[PDB]
Amino acid sequence: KQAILYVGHGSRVKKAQQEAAAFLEGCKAHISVPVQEISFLELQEPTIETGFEACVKQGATHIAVVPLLLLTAAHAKHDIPEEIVRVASRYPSVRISYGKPIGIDEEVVKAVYHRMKDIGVPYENARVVLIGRGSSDPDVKRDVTGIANLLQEMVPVKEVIPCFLTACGPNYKEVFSELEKDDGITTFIVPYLLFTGMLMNEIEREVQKLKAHNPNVYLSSYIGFHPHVKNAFLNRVRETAANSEGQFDFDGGSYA
Ligand code: NI
Ligand code: NI
16 A cells, blocks of 8 residues: 655754644645655654654555655755665565655745735835755755746746855855845845744844845745645655656665
8 A cells, every 4th residue: 555754854943843743744634645654854753764664564565755855955865765775674575755855846936925925015026035044965056046046937026046044155144245235126035944943033133234234125934834835745745656657766775
C-alpha cells in the first residue's frame, strides 16, 4: 500500500517543533494516501527511523519520502538520504521514492507576493531584496536566484536582488549599504525563511538602521508556512508519490 513519509529538519526551539509538526499534520487531509507519517532528521521526534518503521508496520509497500525544505543543500542531498538508507537497509523489500525541496515554484513566489502586499504600500516598479539563509552549496544561490527571476516575471517589480545571511555572497549587509541613497524607489525586504529566530531579529535591527538612512524601505514578515508554501509543498508530495518515470527512485546502498 502507498505511504508518505514527511521529513522535516527538526528544531531545538519548542515553538518551531510545534509549527513544523502542525504543518505536516495539516498536510495529511490533502493527500489521498492512507498511511502518512511525519519525522525529523534531528533534534525532534519522531525520528526518521521511527516514522519509516511506522510506515512499514502499517503495511506500506511503497514509501514516498518528501523533505520539508525550501531549497536544495546538504540536508536534501546527503544527511536525509543517509538516514533513509540506514533505516531502509533493514527492509530491502520496501520501494522508496524521495522528493525534491520546494525550490523554484510559482506558488512560493505567490507567497512572497502576498507578504509584499501585506505591507500596504505600492509595489509597482519597486525593488525587492530577497534574503535567504544561504549556503556554501552553490545550488542554494542558484535556486534563490531562480526564484528571484520568477518573482520578477510574475510581479511588476523593478528588480529582485537575492542575497544571503551567510556562506555565499552578496551578503544582505552589503546590499543594504548600497541602498542608503533614497532615489524615490521603494524597497521591500522579504526574508525567505520558514521560521523566525535569531536571524529574523538581526534582519529587523539591520532594516531599522537602513530605514534610518532610507525611509522608503519596508520589511515584510517572513514567508513561513504561508498557504501558497503549503500548495507548493503539496505539489511536491503529489509528484513524489506519482513518480511517473521513476525519476525519484531511491535505493539502500548509500546514495548521497
Ligand atoms: Ni557521508
Ligand atoms: Ni493568492
